[PDB]
Amino acid sequence: MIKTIAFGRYELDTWYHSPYPEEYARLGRLYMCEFCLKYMKSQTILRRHMAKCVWKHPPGDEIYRKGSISVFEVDGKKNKIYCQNLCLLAKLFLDHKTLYYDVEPFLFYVMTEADNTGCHLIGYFSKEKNSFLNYNVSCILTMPQYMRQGYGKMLIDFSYLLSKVEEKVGSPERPLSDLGLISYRSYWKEVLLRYLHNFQGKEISIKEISQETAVNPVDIVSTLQALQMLKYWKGKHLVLKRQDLIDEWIAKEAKRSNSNKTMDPSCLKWTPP
């Protein structure tokens, strides 16, 4: 079975099992075209491909660019093959991912970092074209060579930015991988502490916050309690503005945004359906 993939300049241990054709699943190493995501039997095979291959980035529309960092929006129906490969790729490293074959009812948002060779795959999230439950994220992944660098947050943040511009509230698809429950929990804290920092009024409804940030009202109540800011005295429900967390949030703001790991609504060029 498979254990490692050659992905661009990287050599990655694979974490799970992916339903690759047994012809390939018989192999312990797969060589992936870093731009079109074709999988190949050997190094010699790949090299010849790379000499033919034309992709220097994914397909679809580049709906966000801020310098080297882009995000492409790929239609599962418009690039069925690119998206299917993407899933197989993501199925290593993602434990509970369902879909591989039928990528048509989905949009894929592919984040990439550009250098002199091309636009390299950072990570992606998929999004149903018509989520019955209003999920703004189906599956989300940071490539291993980009983990613990604040790109997960950027992906999540972009998923809600779409939701905002769509004028919707949404939430990731349940269930939530053990690794992704921590990052959303984290992200919903950034988001909420910021709001309370900017909000100068004396009262607010969840629906207001839900509408400003695009975070689902349940995920808001959840985080408020996680932060222990939902208090009940004298017969009603009060929001408790913790100075500490808010003050820690501002110091943490300096740190993060010194390293430019922030998405930027000014750079998005998108229209929703």
Binding site: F199, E203, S205, I206, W233, K236
Partner: peptide, 28 residues
Amino acid sequence: GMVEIEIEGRLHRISIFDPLEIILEDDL
């Protein structure tokens, strides 16, 4: 809209449309 969960060994239910009061420190 009505959410439910726990605050210090009690059980509590809260609407997502009522304005909730924001406070700092104070007597409670």
